[PDB]
Design a protein around this ligand. Structure first.
Ligand code: HEM
Ligand code: HEM
Ligand SMILES: Nc1ccc2ccccc2n1
Ligand SMILES: Nc1ccc2ccccc2n1
Ligand SMILES: [Cl-]
Ligand SMILES: [Cl-]
Lengths: 362, 362
């Protein structure tokens, strides 16, 4: 059952991949080499060209992603050569540095050795390479509640957080063979953070809010033609709403709306005053303004939706079927102001793609 | 095939309906009477109690409705006795008057004779009993574009609109037997309108915006136990966002965001300023404030979502399965500020319910 599946998926992938690359005639021979490799070894090794394009296709097929217009410019880093935890760590450090690019963020993926027999070579525990810790002890709520379980896991391994609201979690991953993961503190010089100020409300800085520059999702599995790259951290730049409308706004996250209303000088007493809505807008304006002032890449939800419209148009032109998840594609503020809201999307799964995996903690 | 379906649906309805009313033992005999009636006549007649509760159940099963908490207090008007177009007209006039109730809106449904053999006794052309006309001629865009097709249809029948942005469409319905519908102008004394002002921005009134008090949907089919009430107009009170975020905001509707930005004194030049988002909030604040000042019932989306949460809780307590459409239940502004956004809903269809019908115009 195992080698069969790998062969079928590989057939579908190589055909489509080589077609797109204008390498249609090189298929049969490449498919031949692959079949012999599967027979003998139980798996196959992607060329750099297949891997790079497979990672790009996977982003293109990510139904929940509004930023897919730039799928073909993804910066792919091939690190299937790593064997040591020092190599993994430095690769992760490197990813952060080059993706950050002094603020002009490069969408980047670093690809580690794939699963062998379903056995993981490298297992990254971080949800994102850069993420704030979260604590709850005796009524006291500190940091990012979404990070509570991973934080406790890290502290079970000898890490200790300073217990600010913005403790940088350590990188934490487990190598094949080891019973426990290792953790490495993040060098502050690698991590860009953005203090949140408002363009015309001076008191906004009293909230002492900040967020990190680059969202680098590191717990999802990249699947390319039957090969499972369980460890392949990827990043884009933020859409402002992810920070202003969710990370800082959600009651189960930083829950800052009541404090925002206070500093912008409005009452938070009546639903009919729409104070949460007003606070959301000013906070989201602050986030966009702050990243722009510091020279860190970010996109507003209107511009992002426009770009996505072009992705839809580009897809139709290329003869490609379009897939998407309406419930994730709409922005969390003023979604009806975008074209996305006013149409429907086929939520079918197409491979290559990125998939959820079970957390090793929890 | 026809009498079979009617019998099956009637079995399911009467059982559930009489169970809910604590009339469980009266089922068998009532089911008996119904089966004899179907055999002989080809259809059955609901009691006033069955009809009233069936209409209430239908609202309870409306997946796309956020205001379902008050399903059991629906004011049901039984007008299956109407035979003349003067009777229909006066029933519609009456519905408007009693539902409006001087501003303290009563959720109300008026039920007309149902389809006989699939033959309609009464066919209402209006989307809502109160709706603004729409025109497009030689570049000129006037009124509500969503009403363009019905407006042209009305004008094809001898009606003529004044061509303001807020022409009240006439009531228009067709009786069984007649080739054409009849139309009656709406008495202004029956229709409450609300001028849109802002609580602290005096210049907002310069937009000369207004909307009508009561949304009375009149083109949907009520289905109760196999009986098809194709003509059964129903109403609640508005949720503010329906007006401020959609009717007045959509580009394909009144498209007022750019003008709103102007009167509230903000630039509409850069997406990163989130001017559409800010305009949406102030406009939606204006709508809520305006209805409240005039003493016309309205609900904000936060309060409505809270009420819906109680509907969910009430449903669980009653042992009833909950159904809903996430894509319609979330409000079009700050949806992530509501609990609705953060959960999922089974979108299965349960009868009794309200259904779409083909427009006789178009
Ligand atoms: C270029 C900048 C990018 C922007 C602005 C962007 C925007 C977004 C946003 C807003 C989401 C929704 C996240 C949420 O609601 O929690 C999302 C989801 C996603 N994006 Fe992108 N994205 C970008 C680049 C990328 C890249 C480079 C990849 C991978 C190659 C990617 C793959 C995904 C995936 C897999 C999801 C779904 C994650 C999940 O299901 O939890 N995106 N994107
Ligand atoms: C009591 C006040 C009510 C409020 C605030 C309310 C709120 C809403 C809202 C906001 C929508 C979405 C409309 C849209 O997005 O276009 C909706 C849909 C709906 N409501 Fe209600 N509603 C109320 C009462 C009722 C009543 C009395 C009925 C019928 C007995 C009803 C049945 C429906 C139906 C059938 C839909 C879906 C219409 C469609 O699919 O186009 N609602 N409701
Ligand atoms: N802004 C952004 C970029 C990439 C993502 C990948 C997965 C989840 C969220 C993301 N956001
Ligand atoms: N506010 C409100 C009440 C009832 C409705 C019925 C159908 C569509 C929209 C509605 N809105
Ligand atoms: Cl994030
Ligand atoms: Cl409406």
């Amino acid at each position: 059952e195992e080698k069969e599946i790998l062969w079928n998926e590989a057939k579908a992938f190589i055909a489509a991949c080589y077609q797109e690359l204008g390498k249609a005639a090189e298929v049969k021979d490449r498919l031949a080499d692959i079949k012999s490799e599967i027979d003998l070894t139980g798996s196959y090794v992607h060329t750099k060209e297949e891997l790079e394009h497979g990672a790009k296709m996977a982003w293109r097929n990510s139904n929940r992603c509004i930023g897919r217009l730039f799928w073909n410019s993804l910066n792919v880093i091939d690190r299937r050569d790593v064997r040591t935890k020092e190599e993994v760590r430095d690769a992760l450090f490197h990813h952060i540095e080059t993706a950050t690019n002094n603020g002009k963020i490069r969408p980047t993926i670093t690809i580690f050795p794939p699963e062998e027999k379903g056995e993981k070579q490298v297992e990254i525990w971080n949800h994102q390479l850069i993420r704030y810790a979260g604590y709850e002890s005796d009524g006291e709520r500190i940091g990012d509640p979404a990070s509570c379980s991973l934080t406790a896991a890290c502290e079970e391994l000898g890490w200790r957080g300073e217990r600010t609201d913005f403790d940088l979690l350590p990188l934490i991953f487990r190598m094949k063979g080891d019973e426990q993961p290792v953790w490495y503190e993040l060098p502050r010089s690698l991590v860009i953070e953005v203090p949140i100020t408002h363009p015309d409300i001076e008191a906004f800085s009293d909230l002492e809010l900040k967020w990190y520059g680059v969202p680098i999702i590191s717990d999802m599995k990249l699947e390319v033609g039957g090969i499972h790259y369980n460890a392949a951290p990827f990043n884009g730049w933020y859409m402002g709403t992810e920070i202003g409308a969710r990370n800082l706004a959600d009651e189960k996250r930083y829950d800052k709306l009541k404090k925002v209303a206070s500093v912008i000088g409005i009452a938070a007493d009546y639903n009919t005053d729409l104070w949460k809505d007003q606070a959301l807008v000013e906070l989201n304006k602050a986030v966009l303004h702050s990243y722009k002032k510091q020279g860190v890449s970010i996109v507003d939800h209107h511009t992002a939706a426009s770009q996505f419209k072009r992705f839809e148009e580009q897809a139709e032109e290329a003869g490609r079927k379009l897939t998407g998840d309406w419930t994730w594609l709409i922005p969390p503020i003023s979604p009806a102001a975008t074209h996305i809201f006013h149409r429907s999307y086929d939520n079918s799964i197409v491979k290559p793609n990125y998939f959820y995996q079970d957390k090793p903690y929890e």
